[PDB]
Amino acid sequence: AAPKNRRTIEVNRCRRRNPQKLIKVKNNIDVCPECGHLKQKHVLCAYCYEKVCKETAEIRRQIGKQEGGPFKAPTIETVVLYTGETPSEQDQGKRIIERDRKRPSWFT
Amino acid sequence: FTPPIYQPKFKTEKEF
Amino acid sequence: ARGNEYQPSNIKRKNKHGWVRRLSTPAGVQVILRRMLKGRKSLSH
Amino acid sequence: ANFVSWKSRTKYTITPVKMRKSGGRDHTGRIRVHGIGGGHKQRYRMIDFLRFRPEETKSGPFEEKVIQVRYDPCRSADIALVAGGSRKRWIIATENMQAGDTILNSNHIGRMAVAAREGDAHPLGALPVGTLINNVESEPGRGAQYIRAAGTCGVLLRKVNGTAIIQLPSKRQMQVLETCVATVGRVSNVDHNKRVIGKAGRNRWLGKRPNSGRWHRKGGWAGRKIRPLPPMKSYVKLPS
RNA sequence: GCUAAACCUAGCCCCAAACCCCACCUUACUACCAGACAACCUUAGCCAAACCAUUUACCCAAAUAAAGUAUAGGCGAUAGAAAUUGAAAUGGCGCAAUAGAUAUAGUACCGCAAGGGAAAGACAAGCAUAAUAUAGCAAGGACUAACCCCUAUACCUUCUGCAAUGAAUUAACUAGAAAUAACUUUGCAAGGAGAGCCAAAGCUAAGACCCCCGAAACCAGACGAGCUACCUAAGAACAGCUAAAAGAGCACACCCGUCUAUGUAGCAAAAUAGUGGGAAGAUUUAUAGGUAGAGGCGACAAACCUACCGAGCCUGGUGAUAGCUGGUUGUCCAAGAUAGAAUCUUAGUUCAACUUUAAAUUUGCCCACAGAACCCAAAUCCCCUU
RNA sequence: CCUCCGCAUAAGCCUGCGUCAGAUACUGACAAUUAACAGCCCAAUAUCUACAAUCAACCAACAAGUCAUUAUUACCCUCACUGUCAACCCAACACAGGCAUGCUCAUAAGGAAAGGUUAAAAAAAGUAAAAGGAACUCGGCAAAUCUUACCCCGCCUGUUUACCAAAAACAUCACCUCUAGCAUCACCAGUAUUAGAGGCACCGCCUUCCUUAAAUAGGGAUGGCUCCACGAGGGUUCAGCUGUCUCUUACUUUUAACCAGUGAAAUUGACCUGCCCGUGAGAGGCGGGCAUAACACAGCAAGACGAGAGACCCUAUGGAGCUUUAAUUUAUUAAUGCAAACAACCUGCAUUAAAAAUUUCGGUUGGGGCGACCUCGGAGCAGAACCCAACCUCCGAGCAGUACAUGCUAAGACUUCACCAGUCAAAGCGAACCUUUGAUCCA
Ligand SMILES: [Mg+2]
Ligand SMILES: [Mg+2]
Ligand SMILES: [Mg+2]
Ligand SMILES: [Mg+2]
Ligand SMILES: [Mg+2]
Ligand SMILES: [Mg+2]
Ligand SMILES: [Mg+2]
Ligand SMILES: [Mg+2]
Ligand SMILES: [Mg+2]
Ligand SMILES: [Mg+2]
Ligand SMILES: [Mg+2]
Ligand SMILES: [Mg+2]
Ligand SMILES: [Mg+2]
Ligand SMILES: [Mg+2]
Ligand SMILES: [Mg+2]
Ligand SMILES: [Mg+2]
Ligand SMILES: [Mg+2]
Ligand SMILES: [Mg+2]
Ligand SMILES: [Mg+2]
Ligand SMILES: [Mg+2]
Ligand SMILES: [Mg+2]
Ligand SMILES: [Mg+2]
Ligand SMILES: [Mg+2]
Ligand SMILES: [Mg+2]
Ligand SMILES: [Mg+2]
Ligand SMILES: [Mg+2]
Ligand SMILES: [Mg+2]
Ligand SMILES: [Mg+2]
Ligand SMILES: [Mg+2]
Ligand SMILES: [Mg+2]
Ligand SMILES: [Mg+2]
Ligand SMILES: [Mg+2]
Ligand SMILES: [Mg+2]
Ligand SMILES: [Mg+2]
Ligand SMILES: [Mg+2]
Ligand SMILES: [Zn+2]
């Protein structure tokens, strides 16, 4: 059914400026005490997560180079080692992924 | 039946 | 169902609306003359 | 329209000629005869309807051997390839014409009546009165034009002076100079009447198509009506 | 404060004067073989006649005048001479980007085609700043005070009058063109006027007054059969099973379109899904050609002929015509009302009546008596007074 | 996880996801498709060519099926030119449509139904369903299943309203009727067993009961007939089957709602847009009452004479079409006739036809049929100047009789509400000594 009359800007303002339509202020935004970045309470810090994702991507590139081909998932555990690190007694019998950078502070 | 009337294309092909 | 009445073919196009067919009759010569008078870039098809 | 008749061949030949269908259309491209169109592709066999056509540098009555009797797509009658001397030609075959038969073509009007054997051509003056004939000319040397369809047979009704009265298959009398040639017997394929088309498809094969709007005059077909005179206008449509 | 708003010349209009390498008709823009086809032929109709049927002005070869005269003419709408007479010779009280050319261009774009044909370059509306408070044509009277109080049935047009019509809003554009007389003001005056014409105060001059958009149509000349209808030439396709040389059966491809549902500015200006009919034939189909509008084509459904065919499309006649519909733009004042006749006339018109303006003159309206028929009511008419 | 998809040719298109650089498959620049495939041919003149195809051998035919070469005369050079890309064309679109052919028959090729979430209603599609099994409904439509029997119509296969009708309509074999005795552009390179047109319908022959429980349904007691077969035709029925229904439910997908991106259309006088009763012929806005803080969101469809289209009736001295014993013609053809030219052919003038062409559609009475009426006069019908009750009722006149001054002129008047027209009339002159219509033009 077609509108019977043009809706006035007064009516339209009353409609589209209702609090139901206004953007609500978020009160779960704080500062990541680790790095001082803004994060939501329940969500991971975006900057820290980007760090972790980039490091994981590098490790996975090294894993792909080591595996060399599809369907080559090892049947043994994996350990990531950075420059100046040596496999431990526990790290024996586990495939070693060597990273050219130094051990990140947030990695342990 | 009345056939549809097409407006000229230039009205809608204008660019900055 | 309708709308695709144009089924292109260059043979038919030239044989139906071309320069030679236009000149083949006095009426078509006057067609070309009218297009020339109007200044059409394309006199025939 | 760019219509040129297919009947352009100038020299007689035995080879079937590729004939173009018309569809009932004039050279103008407009329908002139309705109900024509399509059908089986056909080839035309040039029929020599002048049976007394002595070969080049030759004259007098001549005989011919029936090489074969063939179905002709372009006729009701079946045709006969017949060879004489050093030439072959297509003629209209008579009812009992067979391959290997001999045919006589004469221009000799004998004082007595020539024994009329089926299939041979004599001037109408030489035939006995009451003989069945076909492929009748209208003028001497014109060429056969009458009594040509399958199973047809005119009758040599009378011969007086140099004029013969023929009964055409339509039972109409025709006067022809007795010097005009006709062939004895009835035309072949005598059972052409009894053929049953059976289905519309067979007519479509024969090239007949169902066609409407055959009149092109305003109001279409209109049977003739008697226009009453002024005194009779009072009784045209008397109510009950 | 955004969107915007504004601008002035790009040009155009009307006059005057002047007379203005190569390729390409084959499939145009294609270096290079047997021509011969080569053109000529009253316009019609719209329209006016209030229908229409005879009829109804239309580059003419010196303007004016003769003269709208002679003539012609369903003697009517209207048409309309000639004899004769003899005119001299670079500009704008034009537009300024919705104007002026369509034009930045016959381009883009649209169409198969003929054809159609643009736009534009230099704090309006709408919003935001700043949503909203009972109640109501949104205002007015007001009020200390926005609302609350009281009053108040939007505008235009068409109807007898309220219902109906139109309008989202802004900007720009968009609609009363003229004679016969009159009247007014000059000039001159028995004459006026710069030949012609008028004149028994006239003549000469000026001032004032006669809209816009819209059919279905008709005719002429083109353009259209790449859709579709039919045809021509030369092609192509048709599994498997059953049957056996079949307008055979079942059923793919393919063609169609029975029924249902979805979709209904959709994917689609006719589609989708399922179902269904035909599926070696009167089959389907590619290519090229042909038939053209009162014509074609049609297994007739008035079907189809480029999406809108009881008669295509385009251009022109054409600013067709419309007694019909709609519209018809500053301010203010004043006068201003229903009404008979005829009419192919009752949706109109002409005359009358009314109405308006100007002018001349003298009675006008009301009415007391008196007066107005025999056949056998209320009132009306008429007019001294007033 | 999906696809009658894909790859090529044709046709069409014309650089339209190649690279780089700037932007947000766009812009600019650079590059590219290489001939063997395909196209672009033939030196002519003559003369030649009956013998299908279908594995072409048997068998099987009718609808009878291009295959064009050889002799002589000329001839000597040799590989040019053009197409070659793409995710493509026609549908206004990056459109679920249209689109020829060869191969692959599920792909060796080609693709992605889900932007994210939630799991409302309504909506679409699908799946399942107790008991029942058409009780639904116009109708078993749809769905699920699988059968039976019979009527009406049409013989059959076909065709048709592209885009609401596929049919009983059109066609059709068959039959009938009518017309035509014939050549060089259709018919027809035909010739009465032929051709054209019309009709008809293949063919063949003779001349109250039953059904249900309930049944406006169904079935049965030259024409008349005969339904073999066939049918998405139209009716009826047995049985079965089923969510059609009793009576609906559950789930999935789409849609949906929320988040993000992009972002229309019809519509709209302005609106600060309530309810009841009344008014008006129908009220949100008028009257009297009642109610009433303000705004989102999702639904609904009672109102907004909702929106957008359309139907019905009437009108116009508006169109157009059709048919005719409407009117006007016969220019044109076809026949004749008469002149003209010396039979043919042709010109002019007539007459008759065919084919057409142009044009019109008065008024009153709910409409239509059949009517009647349309002007004038007299009466009702208007009580008392005039005018009027139109429409309406009755009657009669398109005159008759008389006279043949029943002449000519002329003051003044009347008047059917205009005009046109129509009346009366003194005086005078002259003879004697009145009681019902029609203009102009044109003849
Ligand atoms: Mg096509
Ligand atoms: Mg007129
Ligand atoms: Mg302009
Ligand atoms: Mg503003
Ligand atoms: Mg409106
Ligand atoms: Mg075609
Ligand atoms: Mg098969
Ligand atoms: Mg079959
Ligand atoms: Mg057809
Ligand atoms: Mg019909
Ligand atoms: Mg059209
Ligand atoms: Mg007008
Ligand atoms: Mg006043
Ligand atoms: Mg009249
Ligand atoms: Mg009127
Ligand atoms: Mg489209
Ligand atoms: Mg997807
Ligand atoms: Mg989604
Ligand atoms: Mg169940
Ligand atoms: Mg029932
Ligand atoms: Mg049952
Ligand atoms: Mg029921
Ligand atoms: Mg069903
Ligand atoms: Mg049938
Ligand atoms: Mg059928
Ligand atoms: Mg249809
Ligand atoms: Mg249908
Ligand atoms: Mg029932
Ligand atoms: Mg959104
Ligand atoms: Mg009410
Ligand atoms: Mg209202
Ligand atoms: Mg709501
Ligand atoms: Mg409406
Ligand atoms: Mg009376
Ligand atoms: Mg009077
Ligand atoms: Zn952090």
Residue numbers in the entry:
A (entry chain 0): 79 to 186
B (entry chain d): 41 to 56
C (entry chain 2): 48 to 92
D (entry chain D): 61 to 300
Sentences from the paper on this structure:
The human mitochondrial ribosome (mitoribosome) synthesizes 13 essential subunits of the oxidative phosphorylation (OXPHOS) system. The mitoribosome is composed of a small and a large ribosomal subunit (mtSSU and mtLSU, respectively), which each contain a ribosomal RNA (12S, 16S rRNA) and a number of mitoribosomal proteins (MRPs). Biogenesis of the large ribosomal subunit (LSU) in all translation systems proceeds through distinct steps in which the formation of the peptidyl transferase center (PTC), the active site of the ribosome, represents the last and most critical step and requires the assistance of assembly factors. In human mitochondria, the GTPases GTPBP5, GTPBP6, GTPBP7, and GTPBP10 mediate mtLSU maturation, as their deletion results in a loss of active mitoribosomes and stalls mtLSU biogenesis at distinct states.
We isolated mtLSU complexes from a human cell line lacking GTPBP6, which accumulate assembly intermediates that contain GTPBP7, GTPBP10, and GTPBP5 as well as MALSU1, MTERF4, and NSUN412. Particle classification yielded two distinct reconstructions of mtLSU assembly intermediates at overall resolutions of 2.2 and 2.5 Å, respectively, which led to refined structures. The structure of the MTERF4-NSUN4-bound assembly intermediate reveals a distinct rRNA conformation, which appears to be stabilized by binding of MTERF4-NSUN4 to the interfacial side of the 16S rRNA. MTERF4 interacts with the mtLSU through contacts with h75 in the L1 stalk (nucleotides 2743–2756 and 2792–2804) and with the C-terminal tail of uL2m (residues 275–300). NSUN4 binds to the mtLSU on top of the P loop/h80 (nucleotides 2815–2821) and h81 (nucleotides 2841–2853), next to bL33m. In the MTERF4-NSUN4 assembly intermediate, this region is partially unfolded and wraps over the outward-facing RNA-binding groove of MTERF4. Although the density did not allow for atomic modeling, comparison shows that helices h68 and h69 would clash with MTERF4 in their mature conformation, indicating that MTERF4 binds a premature conformation of the interfacial rRNA. MTERF4-NSUN4 may thus act as a quality-control checkpoint by sequestering the interfacial rRNA to prevent subunit joining prior to final mtLSU maturation. In the intermediate lacking GTPBP5, the PTC is partially disordered and adopts a premature conformation. The PTC loop is partially mobile, and nucleotides 2975–2995 form a loop that base pairs with the tip of the P loop/h80.
